[PDB]
Amino acid sequence: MVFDVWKSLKKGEVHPVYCLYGKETYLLQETVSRIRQTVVDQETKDFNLSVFDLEEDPLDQAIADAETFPFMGERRLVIVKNPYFLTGEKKKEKIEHNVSALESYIQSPAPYTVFVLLAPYEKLDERKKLTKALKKHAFMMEAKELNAKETTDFTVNLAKTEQKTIGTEAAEHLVLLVNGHLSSIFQEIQKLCTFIGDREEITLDDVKMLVARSLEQNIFELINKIVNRKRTESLQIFYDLLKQNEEPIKIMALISNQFRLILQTKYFAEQGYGQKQIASNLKVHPFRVKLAMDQARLFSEEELRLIIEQLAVMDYEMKTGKKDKQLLLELFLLQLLKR
């Protein structure tokens, strides 16, 4: 897990070869950053840090760097992004790398180098020689996209890394408020750990007082309330947005993005595709795809198409000429509530 690596780095356990994979790029990024903070010194970072992207860079140069002594430092850091040849994708499109030299390197790596493969794919091809070599010689870490329940456990465990705790109710509420984004959970957990001072436990009350419901979560909820005929609850959500000075045009764009998502999700769901395949097809986090799937059940295809076109018209009427922007939005939302 991400936590195994993070805890290891803090104990001074830094290994010569890592393979960080999975589609949760934020955790890949955060981990690469912690490894950097561990091995690189700012005074020598020009000399002891190298980043390559195998989409455009030669593997051999990354290896030649890895085999160079650190310069006025104890360790060197070499980062190698996008080993697409670890997957089963169409191999004709890009650079034809020297995989065998890489296999050789990870099997006998330079003791003074920390070599990190950053492979933002869900799955590596287990049949590939190099994949087998990594599972043996590299510290493998998967940063997968989480569902609702997994996201709660992640939040609970995250608090522990700061020597605090958070109960499952408080954690579930936090995850709800930030609409499941891990980057937001990480941020809010750090704020909460500081906030509670000497106290050990982040309470549900701490979460509610400190953590603001995200705009994107508000948009989601506004749409729930509307499709559920809860007239005042949804008028209240909309008002609060305006009242904290969100721009009507921005509110509209987010509403538009969600309705487009619902239509797409409904389209693929009705062909039997699951939360899993839809997220990867749409390049949207499964957490957010699940919610769109739930909402898609409450609208017909024809409604969604109408709603979407209404929003494109509003976008144009707002961007061009002088119509009352808030009024345009009021009318739209009122139409939705009668209809």
Swiss-Prot record:
Component of the DNA clamp loading complex consisting of tau(3):delta(1):delta'(1). The DNA polymerase III holoenzyme complex contains at least 10 different subunits organized into 3 functionally essential subassemblies: the Pol III core, the beta sliding clamp processivity factor and the clamp-loading complex. The Pol III core (subunits alpha, epsilon and theta) contains the polymerase and the 3'-5' exonuclease proofreading activities. The polymerase is tethered to the template via the dimeric beta sliding clamp processivity factor. Belongs to the DNA polymerase HolA subunit family. InterPro entries: DNA_pol3_clamp-load_cplx_C (IPR008921), DNA_pol3_delta-like_C (IPR048466), DNA_pol3_delta_N (IPR010372), DNA_polIII_delta (IPR005790), P-loop_NTPase (IPR027417). It comes from the Bacteria. Its main location: cytoplasm. Keywords: Cytoplasm, DNA replication, DNA-directed DNA polymerase, Nucleotidyltransferase, Transferase. GO terms for cellular component: cytoplasm; DNA polymerase III complex; nucleoid. Part of the beta sliding clamp loading complex, which hydrolyzes ATP to load the beta clamp onto primed DNA to form the DNA replication pre-initiation complex. DNA polymerase III is a complex, multichain enzyme responsible for most of the replicative synthesis in bacteria. This DNA polymerase also exhibits 3'-5' exonuclease activity. The delta subunit is the wrench that will open the beta subunit dimer. One of its GO terms (biological process) is DNA-templated DNA replication. One of its GO terms (molecular function) is DNA binding. It catalyses: DNA(n) + a 2'-deoxyribonucleoside 5'-triphosphate = DNA(n+1) + diphosphate. Pfam families: DNA_pol3_delta (PF06144), DNA_pol3_delta_C (PF21694). This is DNA polymerase III subunit delta. It is found in: Cytoplasm, Nucleoid. The keyword Cytoplasm applies. Its EC number is 2.7.7.7. Signal peptide: none annotated. Disruption phenotype: Essential, it cannot be disrupted.
